[PDB]
Design a protein around this ligand. Structure first.
Ligand code: CU
Ligand code: CU
Ligand code: CU
Ligand code: CU
Ligand code: CU
Ligand code: CU
Lengths: 334, 334, 334
């Protein structure tokens, strides 16, 4: 108990897929990380004709990435603004006790709460809202879930215990939504989250999502929201899915070092084509880009990637290596 | 072949989630463990307005937990009472040959059979009914599946080969069920399994369970059936799912050592938030309770946890530790 | 870059579940393995009353297994005959760049393409067609996916790095299909893939397959297509599923060494009852048969195994071992 002598670092969170500033290898001993976030409830557009009455941490789906190191403390201030219409809370799978923080952070619109917990376990972990009861799933599939990554104090290590570093970390937040359709087969729009609850419950109960998206919308990470790398970059892709499985794959690439259950002191596997993110967790994969051009990072049920929304692109620069792959003879008539 | 010289230990099974008396470190060489079970067909109540025409081992869903040590033998007398209507048999995934024992145990109402098999392989394994052909999935989703845990002779070891011990083991048997609905949307009830076979088959073919439950029924392991520990107990959660995947998570806690594919000579992973039970298997996770309070053990597709029934609670005694977690500022007005 | 000095090996692919000739341990240094495949579009029969306007590599579902060794090159001539009706390409999850080769092998009916890539990573790997867009899932669930196994040069090793060898390798390609039904409830048949496109899209969007099959059809690996072994054979089962997860289980056996994410420089697990093939990948499992008789190799959601089609059988000859299992009392009246 105590802590008056640990340093405090106050952070400014940035919207996903980017991450707030940090260091892989901790620059000093345990600190108290201070974070603040508000619940913003608002309608979001998931696709060209599909909308969700969302509930979100800081206005974005997923909520922003938090990064700290193992042995640190996390003190979060959570605000539920007076214009929201429901109570929210927050459960950190990285924390120990009271339902992850969920039993000490229930706040009604108009209130705030400050939770502290010590980040004893290294890994990426989901956090998400869980107000109690029959509503808990409904708040997660309305968008309130993000991730906090607890890095080991000395940074990541590989399956032999040797240090490894990434040049860039992107947080891909995947989320399943259950938008109801009226009779003519078109998506329904509602005036706030409650009005749409009962119709959304009926679709939830079939367990088939109408949309599975990265970063909050079909296309959020393609086009202008494409991810970027260079040949030689070691990139860390952190991938959460708070309520339903996912099987990520980098098309054209591999997972060089993968922790698919997400906890960095376990040995990562090598050379994977596809890995698996259990619903309710965050895993992480490093890949060093060896060829330039366009890559798609997708949930490899391709129906879920292409029809429901779970595809991102990565644009990579650099020179092409024909010894890895060559079009020996371009398409030509038989 | 032979065996007349090994000792014989006759056990009395107990209802899940508890386990019959046993020891973690084999208190001698190989013994033949004698068990006896009946099949009981009966209607059971899954939820406030949902029932299933069940077929069960011993009266319960899941069937009771058997516990033996690697290299023992298992001699089970299975009885099919005259009052059942259908043939039943049992397939032990822990056993080698004749379809897990299903090919040597098919018995009609009024008959018994006695199968012996050597438990050559350590881990938690599913056993379930498998009468033959198209009826295998229907018997399983009507309730006939349980678990046998074959412990290594010298007890469990962590990922460094060091001995770890649990103070308590709980058997969580998870089961998906496909209860059909009539035109008004309410669940149907039948006079026997046959009569609801056709209707059931149609919900089976959609692959969407109506109910996914621990211990045979919505709330079976909450309220009076909540699981209990104290701070400092090391608890072993053995989790089966004989027909569909699950992704267990202890909310407020973690898997300190987890064998999600359930076979103890594999190394276990540490610090998991959520782990993954493949349909058709049992896994097992050890956690040492650090904080007191209520914890929910759930299947973390939270629609399945809370709409379909896959939630258990644990009430744990003891003293709170504010250094792991603290409500620094209780909910207050902005 | 270069290669004019490496030996070139020309292979003759065979229909799954068999494999073309190959040595487990490479008998020479890196070679260029040349393979040729045509796309064949044809209506195939998936079950007594269900058909699929299929698109296939070389006329089988799965496409045929390719075996090479780590550090070899692979140079495939892919051919899209003039009678076909759509463009096709190929994406090898074994390869690095240009979307697995799919950005270099897009060919219209009446064309061929020659793609060479270096098989840098050891493991079994899915390959599949992915022409671009919205169509990608639809070509893969119309059948165009097989597997390449890139064996370490020194063949397979156990969990401690020691040599293990298989006497037989079978390739079990599992594929999910989404055959639409008309109002009377019967499956529809169509004149070519295009015509049945929009109907098939609407079943695909439920994410519920109508059929889940091994080797292209229900019962394809049963009866006359059953797999065969004798007691003491070590049989390697390579299992691919390009678009959806599967949980294979050998009923009456176990996985003795399983790489469920399929990459052989990761250590295998042992004694599994059921393992997990993530959609978008292939895994593999070694088992030494110990008992003679019929075994079922299944996808252990039993609905998927029996209702939907994912059951194959294995007929094993040899002497029965009573010490592993014995019917001590045959069914008798109480
Ligand atoms: Cu909320
Ligand atoms: Cu949670
Ligand atoms: Cu039965
Ligand atoms: Cu089974
Ligand atoms: Cu194609
Ligand atoms: Cu792919």
């Amino acid at each position: 108990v105590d802590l008056s002598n640990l340093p405090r670092v106050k952070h400014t969170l940035v919207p996903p897929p980017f991450a707030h500033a940090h260091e892989q290898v901790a620059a000093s001993g345990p600190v108290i990380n201070e974070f603040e976030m508000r619940i913003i409830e608002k309608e979001v557009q998931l696709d060209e004709d599909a909308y969700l009455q969302a509930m979100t941490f800081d206005g974005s789906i997923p909520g922003p990435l938090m990064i700290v190191h193992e042995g640190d403390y996390v003190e979060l201030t959570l605000i539920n603004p007076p214009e929201n219409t429901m109570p929210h809370n927050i459960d950190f799978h990285a924390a120990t006790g009271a339902l992850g923080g969920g039993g000490l952070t229930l706040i009604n619109p108009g209130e705030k709460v400050v939770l502290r917990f010590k980040a004893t376990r290294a890994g990426a972990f989901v956090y998400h809202c869980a107000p109690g009861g029959p509503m808990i799933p409904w708040h997660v599939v309305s968008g309130t879930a993000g991730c906090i990554m607890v890095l080991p104090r000395d940074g990541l290590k590989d399956h032999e215990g040797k240090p490894v570093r990434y040049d860039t970390v992107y947080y891909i937040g995947e989320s399943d939504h259950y938008i109801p359709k009226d009779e003519d087969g078109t998506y329904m729009r509602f005036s706030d989250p409650s009005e749409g609850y009962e119709d959304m419950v009926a679709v939830m109960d079939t367990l088939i999502p109408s949309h599975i998206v990265f970063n909050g919308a079909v296309g959020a990470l393609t086009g202008e929201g494409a991810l970027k790398a260079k040949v030689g970059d070691n990139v860390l892709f952190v991938h959460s899915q708070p309520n339903r499985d996912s099987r990520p794959h980098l098309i054209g690439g591999h997972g060089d070092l993968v922790w698919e259950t997400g906890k960095f002191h376990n040995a990562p596997e090598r050379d994977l084509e596809t890995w698996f993110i259990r619903g309710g967790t965050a895993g992480a994969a490093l890949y060093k880009f060896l060829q330039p051009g366009v890559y798609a990072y997708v949930n490899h049920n391709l129906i879920e990637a292409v029809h429901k929304g779970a595809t991102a692109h990565v644009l990579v620069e650099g020179e092409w290596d024909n010894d890895l792959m060559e079009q020996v003879v371009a398409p030509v008539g038989l």
